Amino acid sequence: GAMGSMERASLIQKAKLAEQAERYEDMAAFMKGAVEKGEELSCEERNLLSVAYKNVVGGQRAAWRVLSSIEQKSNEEGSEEKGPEVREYREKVETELQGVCDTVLGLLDSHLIKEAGDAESRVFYLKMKGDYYRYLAEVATGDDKKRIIDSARSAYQEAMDISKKEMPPTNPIRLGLALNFSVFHYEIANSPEEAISLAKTTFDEAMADLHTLSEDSYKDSTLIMQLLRDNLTLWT
C-alpha cells in the first residue's frame, strides 16, 4: 500500500524511530509495510511487529473496556435513558479494534506463518494468531463467538505443541505463549482450573531449567515467570 515505495531497511529504521517517539500507529504501519515486502522477518523484526500492534490494540482495548462499562451501567434499573450515543461510540471503537486484529491476522495468513519453518518463528506467529483471535473474542457477542474462541484455542494449541517439542522450558517465547494461553483459559474459555494448572506447570518446569542459563538469559526468563506468579496470586 502506502509503504510500497519505501525500502525495506528504511521501513525498519523508521519503525525503531517511531518506537522511540512513542508513535505506535506509525510503527505498526511501517512494520506492515516491511512484512508486505515478502521476505521473512528476523527475530528483532518480529519483536518490532509485536510491540507495534500490541501498543495499538492496547489503546483500543482499554478504550473499549471504559465504554463497555459505561454502556452496561446505562442498562441498569433506575438508569436514565440518554440515547444511542454510548452504544454508537462503543461500536465505533469496537469496529476499529476488529480492523486492527483483522490486519494482523491477515499478515500472519499472507504469508508469515506458511513461510516460518524454524520453531522460534513458527511459535511466535502462532502465539500472535492466538492473541489477536483472543482480542476479537473479548468483544464478540454474536453467532461467531464460539468459532472465534476455537480459532484462538487452535492457534495456541499448535504453538504449545511445537514449543514443547522444540524449545527449552525457559525459552521466553514458550513462556509468553503459556502465560497468554493461561489467560485465554481464565478470561475467555471459562476454564479457571485449566488456567491455574497451566500456569503452575509452566512455572515449575521453567524453575527446574534455570540452572542451564547465563545471567542475561536468566533475567529474560524470570521476568516472564514473575507474570505467571502474579496471575497465580490473583487467581488463587
Partner: peptide, 9 residues
C-alpha cells in the same frame, strides 16, 4: 486485571 506478554507501559 490478568497479566499477559508482551505488555505496554
Amino acid at each position: 486485571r490478568s497479566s499477559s506478554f508482551p505488555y505496554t507501559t
